[PDB]
Design an enzyme around this catalytic site. Structure first.
Site, PDB file in Angstrom:
ATOM      1  N   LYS A   1     -15.753  -0.807   0.261  1.00  0.00           N
ATOM      2  CA  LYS A   1     -14.300  -0.865   0.361  1.00  0.00           C
ATOM      3  C   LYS A   1     -13.750  -1.868  -0.646  1.00  0.00           C
ATOM      4  O   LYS A   1     -14.077  -3.058  -0.589  1.00  0.00           O
ATOM      5  CB  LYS A   1     -13.878  -1.240   1.781  1.00  0.00           C
ATOM      6  CG  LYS A   1     -14.279  -0.205   2.823  1.00  0.00           C
ATOM      7  CD  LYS A   1     -13.717  -0.520   4.202  1.00  0.00           C
ATOM      8  CE  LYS A   1     -14.173  -1.881   4.709  1.00  0.00           C
ATOM      9  NZ  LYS A   1     -15.658  -2.004   4.722  1.00  0.00           N
ATOM     10  N   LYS A   2     -12.919  -1.376  -1.566  1.00  0.00           N
ATOM     11  CA  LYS A   2     -12.225  -2.204  -2.549  1.00  0.00           C
ATOM     12  C   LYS A   2     -13.170  -2.712  -3.633  1.00  0.00           C
ATOM     13  O   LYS A   2     -12.729  -3.362  -4.585  1.00  0.00           O
ATOM     14  CB  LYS A   2     -11.529  -3.385  -1.869  1.00  0.00           C
ATOM     15  CG  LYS A   2     -10.190  -3.734  -2.503  1.00  0.00           C
ATOM     16  CD  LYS A   2      -9.871  -5.216  -2.397  1.00  0.00           C
ATOM     17  CE  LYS A   2     -10.574  -6.012  -3.484  1.00  0.00           C
ATOM     18  NZ  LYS A   2     -10.246  -7.463  -3.411  1.00  0.00           N
TER      19      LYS A   2
ATOM     20  N   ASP B   1      -2.303  -6.156  -6.517  1.00  0.00           N
ATOM     21  CA  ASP B   1      -2.235  -5.591  -5.181  1.00  0.00           C
ATOM     22  C   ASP B   1      -0.984  -4.723  -5.053  1.00  0.00           C
ATOM     23  O   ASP B   1      -0.163  -4.630  -5.969  1.00  0.00           O
ATOM     24  CB  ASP B   1      -2.247  -6.703  -4.132  1.00  0.00           C
ATOM     25  CG  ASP B   1      -3.639  -7.245  -3.870  1.00  0.00           C
ATOM     26  OD1 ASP B   1      -4.608  -6.714  -4.452  1.00  0.00           O
ATOM     27  OD2 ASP B   1      -3.764  -8.204  -3.080  1.00  0.00           O
TER      28      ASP B   1
ATOM     29  N   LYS C   1       0.305   2.435   8.076  1.00  0.00           N
ATOM     30  CA  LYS C   1       0.168   1.012   8.368  1.00  0.00           C
ATOM     31  C   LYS C   1       1.026   0.162   7.441  1.00  0.00           C
ATOM     32  O   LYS C   1       1.579  -0.856   7.874  1.00  0.00           O
ATOM     33  CB  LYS C   1      -1.300   0.595   8.264  1.00  0.00           C
ATOM     34  CG  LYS C   1      -2.225   1.257   9.285  1.00  0.00           C
ATOM     35  CD  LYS C   1      -1.634   1.257  10.688  1.00  0.00           C
ATOM     36  CE  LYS C   1      -2.696   1.519  11.745  1.00  0.00           C
ATOM     37  NZ  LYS C   1      -3.223   2.910  11.678  1.00  0.00           N
ATOM     38  N   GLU C   2       1.150   0.554   6.178  1.00  0.00           N
ATOM     39  CA  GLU C   2       1.948  -0.179   5.196  1.00  0.00           C
ATOM     40  C   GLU C   2       3.039   0.746   4.672  1.00  0.00           C
ATOM     41  O   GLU C   2       2.722   1.838   4.158  1.00  0.00           O
ATOM     42  CB  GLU C   2       1.079  -0.699   4.054  1.00  0.00           C
ATOM     43  CG  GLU C   2       0.013   0.278   3.574  1.00  0.00           C
ATOM     44  CD  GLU C   2      -0.954  -0.351   2.591  1.00  0.00           C
ATOM     45  OE1 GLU C   2      -1.400  -1.492   2.839  1.00  0.00           O
ATOM     46  OE2 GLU C   2      -1.271   0.296   1.571  1.00  0.00           O
TER      47      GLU C   2
ATOM     48  N   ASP D   1      -7.264   5.546  -1.217  1.00  0.00           N
ATOM     49  CA  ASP D   1      -8.537   5.843  -0.568  1.00  0.00           C
ATOM     50  C   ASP D   1      -8.406   7.038   0.368  1.00  0.00           C
ATOM     51  O   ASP D   1      -9.079   8.060   0.192  1.00  0.00           O
ATOM     52  CB  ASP D   1      -9.034   4.612   0.192  1.00  0.00           C
ATOM     53  CG  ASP D   1      -9.652   3.573  -0.723  1.00  0.00           C
ATOM     54  OD1 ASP D   1      -9.361   3.600  -1.938  1.00  0.00           O
ATOM     55  OD2 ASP D   1     -10.430   2.730  -0.229  1.00  0.00           O
TER      56      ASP D   1
ATOM     57  N   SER E   1      -4.095  -0.298  -5.779  1.00  0.00           N
ATOM     58  CA  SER E   1      -4.960   0.203  -4.718  1.00  0.00           C
ATOM     59  C   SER E   1      -4.156   0.342  -3.434  1.00  0.00           C
ATOM     60  O   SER E   1      -3.453  -0.593  -3.033  1.00  0.00           O
ATOM     61  CB  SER E   1      -6.156  -0.728  -4.504  1.00  0.00           C
ATOM     62  OG  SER E   1      -5.756  -2.086  -4.547  1.00  0.00           O
TER      63      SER E   1
ATOM     64  N   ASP F   1     -14.842 -11.633  -4.604  1.00  0.00           N
ATOM     65  CA  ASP F   1     -14.238 -12.159  -5.825  1.00  0.00           C
ATOM     66  C   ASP F   1     -14.899 -13.466  -6.251  1.00  0.00           C
ATOM     67  O   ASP F   1     -15.114 -13.699  -7.446  1.00  0.00           O
ATOM     68  CB  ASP F   1     -12.730 -12.338  -5.630  1.00  0.00           C
ATOM     69  CG  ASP F   1     -12.387 -13.374  -4.575  1.00  0.00           C
ATOM     70  OD1 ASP F   1     -12.948 -14.486  -4.617  1.00  0.00           O
ATOM     71  OD2 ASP F   1     -11.550 -13.071  -3.699  1.00  0.00           O
TER      72      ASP F   1
END
Ligand SMILES: O=c1ccn([C@@H]2O[C@H](COP(=O)(O)OP(=O)(O)O)[C@@H](O)[C@H]2O)c(=O)[nH]1
Ligand SMILES: OC[C@H]1O[C@@H](O[C@H]2[C@H](O)[C@@H](O)[C@H](O)O[C@@H]2CO)[C@H](O)[C@@H](O)[C@@H]1O
Lengths: 694, 68, 67, 90
Positions: A279-280, A304, A108-109, A138, A102, A460
């Site tokens: 989201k997620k 991740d 940002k990353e 996304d 994902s 979770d």
């Protein structure tokens, strides 16, 4: 022959541990008789507050000590599994696995880390006809799509080189940057010659990715255009039709030698204004639906974009437990511990968090099994649909429970999985595109009782609780190698925010319908000793409020009162001595069998207290009102430090009224305030300081 | 002396430890180096050093203080 | 040594010179063989908990014997 | 220019010793055999006739340039059951 074995503690270190705790309870009970038969200490108000606060701490300890009963250990072997299932002559009889990744934003990353993770997934030690990979983004971006194409091209050279020489780790970024002697056990004759060429190729690939990333810093006024000469379908981040593509598949690119490689699939969702997108939690559900139509599999693996595989035999180890005919009948998922690298020798902020993993998880594994964390788990496909464990007692119903797509409804009927009537590829692609509509989950039960559960931020925890309530079981694994490694926060700002985020999720779950207090009683199937374990995880934040109250008594008493309990009557001395010694003996025994170092235990205790007065406080009050800045979070801890240091020094000054002997309580309050300024001092001063503290 | 030092640090951007290092360093330099320099310049004015001897003044002050 | 102190300083005054000499000799003995005999255990130093452990042991023993 | 080649050659040489050790890890059931096709004279650690050999001597291998190198001698003693053999002095 068995594929795995499980053994308990050798019983030499178990009986003394149980005998210590059982004796401690009696000592605590007797101690309260003294504190209730002494109603006066010159201040009723202080007496009322102190007794109530202390009683809470006893209850908190009770809810936390029992779950650590009956630890268990396990072992596994891999040689027998290969001989039994992978016997030569006939084809392999192993099961298939799937992977999910994902991503959200490229800027940002950095994309280099994501590319490394993708390469690692494709280098697993498993038959190439079984494993598969999926990538989901996304926010549609051209950089991610263009970066994946470059990664696929480089995968042709990377794969065969790793397999032949059996090198580890298989992540080029985290493998080359290692000072461990690379000529340790290699025996091949041409290892050096091939290694030099590979290093040169990797450097060139890195430069190409850097140029691509820097190119997209600006945005053309008209909009991004593809190489073929057509506009990029997604020009608005809030509006883009869903897209699906396949790369490095069976019918396509092939290795240099001439072999095949695992297939890679790129999928993007559809977004339109006026709708709320989870989201997620909707992303995972969308991937599951798409995967079923394209290639059905019996197991699902989640990861991740930061963590990467460290062991090439992890897949075999996980499959050796789920495929066992006897013990594998009732297993929902297998949990793996999470480890972090790039950490200094002095872990000031206890980022590793070994106490919870090495103590709590092992103890809780004895009743039913571990708890879902979020990463590194293999989920049974049938369990996600919400059917129920085996061996236990119409179209309209199926349409209303799953959806309107007929292909998906018929897909779940397969005993094992696969394409039922091997239709043409074009039809399957069209169905996959149609089964990812924006308003597909309107009348369905998705989220409410099927798949990932929406609602609280820490979904979770909530998702695992529902599955366990139906009688499922989970297992724990601890291979010699970590088998999974990621990254951890560096600065304190992220760490404090991370602790604050977890606390808020727990508060939301408590006030929702899914509360263990009055949920799951109907039908049983949940061990009474685990429901208690669930209760502690939900009600832990409330323990912070009394804690701040206790830390205030030493200053108030030392200022005016100077008296908390009556002087010992020759009977409390033995009781006090028995109390202090009891805590020491239990700690050493836990260290003896747990294996954790004494130092790390002290760090965990120090971190807990500071983390409660800063964020856990907000979750109970900010959240009560809801049903903070780095400077603002540090406010409550600072107030205690100033009060407890100005007051203590003032006490000495007024002690000059008496003679050389000021009656004893000075040491009584001195080590009472030292404790306050011995665990809270090294963090507040340490986290800021000036430099070198000299 | 304390309040003034803190304010200087706030705007100058220097660190407190650097300030302490400079202050104590100035003391040692004054005892040995500048004492000899002032005297050597007086001789040529009226007219019209090794490492070992340079440490003599500092050594004497330390000994007399500790013994006293 | 500690117990000796806790005895001598309780009553004896003007007789604390021989006590000082005995304490100095005990310290000479202790210093030679504490570092090597201790450092082998632990990574660098287990002082954080060791100091509090020694303090609590000392105070508990003193109080119990005083009672 | 020579240093780079020397480093490459050392690494290549260092790989083969590890290869030899890996092969020697496991022993055959019958016993070790020499390349020429004869058994190794010493098959028992406690029983082996003495052996002597000379390598890199005056009459033998020569340097690349064409010069000579110091001689080397390899010697192994003889051991039989029923006696005492002092470790180092003997
Ligand atoms: O809307 C979102 C937000 C986050 N993530 C992913 O969720 C993972 C975990 O995010 P975080 O650490 O914030 O929790 C990351 O890989 C993100 O890319 C995602 O897929 N969708
Ligand atoms: O609350 C869910 C959250 O738990 C995290 O583990 C926590 C644990 O819940 C808490 O009781 C303990 O004090 O701290 C650990 C972390 O150090 C877990 O790591 C998360 O993945 C999970 O979302």
């Amino acid at each position: 022959e068995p594929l795995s074995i499980v053994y308990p503690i050798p019983r030499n270190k178990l009986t003394p541990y149980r005998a210590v705790i059982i004796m401690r309870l009696i000592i605590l009970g007797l101690f309260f008789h003294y504190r209730i038969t002494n109603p006066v200490d010159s201040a009723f108000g202080l007496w009322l507050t102190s007794v109530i606060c202390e009683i809470w701490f006893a209850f908190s300890w009770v809810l936390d000590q029992f779950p650590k009963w009956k630890p268990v250990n396990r072992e596994t072997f891999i040689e027998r599994l290969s001989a039994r299932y992978e016997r030569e002559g006939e084809p392999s009889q192993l099961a298939a696995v799937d992977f999910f990744v994902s991503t959200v934003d490229p800027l940002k990353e950095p994309p280099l880390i994501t590319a490394n993770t993708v390469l690692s997934i494709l280098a697993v030690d498993y038959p190439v006809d079984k494993v598969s990979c999926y990538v989901s983004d996304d926010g549609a971006a051209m950089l991610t799509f263009e970066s994946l194409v470059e990664t696929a091209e480089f995968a042709r050279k990377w794969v065969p080189f790793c397999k032949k020489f059996s090198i580890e780790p298989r992540a080029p970024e985290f493998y080359f940057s290692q000072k461990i002697d690379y000529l340790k056990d290699k025996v091949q004759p041409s290892f050096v010659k091939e290694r030099r060429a590979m290093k040169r190729d990797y450097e060139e690939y890195k430069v190409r990715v850097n140029a691509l990333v820097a190119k997209a810093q600006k945005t053309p006024d008209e909009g991004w255009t593809m190489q073929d000469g057509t506009p990029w379908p997604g020009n608005n981040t809030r509006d883009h039709p869903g897209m699906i593509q396949v790369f490095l598949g069976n019918t396509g690119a092939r290795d240099i030698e001439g072999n095949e490689l695992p297939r890679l699939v790129y999928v993007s969702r559809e977004k339109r204004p006026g709708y709320q997108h989870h989201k997620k939690a909707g992303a995972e559900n969308a991937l599951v639906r798409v995967s079923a139509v394209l290639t059905n599999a019996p197991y699902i693996l989640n990861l991740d974009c930061d963590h990467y595989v460290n062991n090439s035999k992890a897949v075999r180890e996980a499959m050796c437990i789920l495929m066992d005919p006897q013990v594998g009948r009732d297993v929902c998922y297998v949990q793996f511990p999470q480890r972090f690298d790039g950490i200094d020798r002095s872990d000031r902020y206890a980022n590793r968090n070994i106490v919870f993993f090495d103590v709590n998880m092992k103890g809780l594994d004895g009743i039913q099994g571990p708890m879902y964390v979020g990463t590194g788990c293999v989920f049974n496909r049938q369990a996600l649909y919400g059917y129920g464990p085996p061996s236990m007692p119409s179209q309209l119903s199926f349409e209303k429970t799953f959806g309107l797509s007929p292909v998906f409804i018929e897909s779940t009927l397969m005993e094992n999985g696969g394409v039922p009537e091997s239709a043409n590829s074009s039809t399957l692609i069209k169905e996959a595109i149609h089964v990812i509509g924006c308003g597909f989950e309107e009348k369905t039960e998705w989220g409410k009782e099927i798949g990932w559960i929406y609602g609280s931020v820490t979904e979770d925890i909530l998702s695992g609780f529902k599955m366990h309530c139906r009688g499922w079981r989970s297992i724990y694994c601890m291979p010699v190698r970590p088998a999974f490694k990621g990254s951890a926060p560096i600065n304190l700002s992220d760490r404090l925010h991370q602790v604050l985020r977890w606390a808020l999720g727990s508060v939301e779950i408590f006030f929702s319908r899914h509360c263990p207090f009055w949920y799951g009683y109907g039908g049983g199937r949940l061990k009474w000793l685990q429901r208690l374990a669930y209760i502690n995880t939900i009600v832990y934040p409330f323990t912070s409020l009394p804690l701040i109250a206790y830390c205030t008594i030493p200053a108030v008493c030392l200022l005016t009162g100077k008296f908390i309990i009556p002087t010992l009557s020759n009977l409390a001395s033995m009781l006090f001595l028995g109390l202090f010694i009891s805590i020491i003996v239990t700690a050493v025994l836990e260290l003896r069998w747990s294996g954790v170092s004494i130092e790390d235990l002290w760090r965990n205790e120090q971190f807990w207290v500071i983390g409660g007065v800063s964020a856990h406080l907000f979750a109970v009050f900010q959240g009560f009102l809801k049903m903070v800045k780095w400077t603002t979070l540090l406010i409550p801890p600072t107030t205690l430090l100033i009060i407890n240091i100005v007051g203590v020094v003032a006490g000495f000054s007024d002690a000059l009224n008496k003679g050389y002997e000021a009656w004893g309580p000075l040491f009584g309050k001195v080590f009472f305030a030292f404790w306050v300024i011995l665990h809270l001092y090294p963090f507040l001063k340490g986290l800021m300081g000036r430099q070198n503290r000299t | 002396i304390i309040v003034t030092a803190v304010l200087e640090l706030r705007w100058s951007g220097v660190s407190i430890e650097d300030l302490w290092r400079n202050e104590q360093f100035w003391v040692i330099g004054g005892v040995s180096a500048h004492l000899f320099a002032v005297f050597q310049g007086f001789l040529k004015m009226l007219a019209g050093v090794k490492w070992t001897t340079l440490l003599i003044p500092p050594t004497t002050l330390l000994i007399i203080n500790i013994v006293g | 040594v500690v117990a000796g102190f806790s005895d001598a300083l309780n009553k004896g005054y003007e007789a604390w010179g021989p006590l000082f000499g005995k304490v100095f000799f005990a310290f000479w003995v202790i210093l030679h063989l504490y570092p090597f005999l201790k450092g082998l255990m632990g990574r660098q130093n287990r002082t954080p908990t060791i100091v509090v452990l020694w303090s609590v042991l000392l105070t508990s023993v003193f109080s119990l014997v005083w009672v």
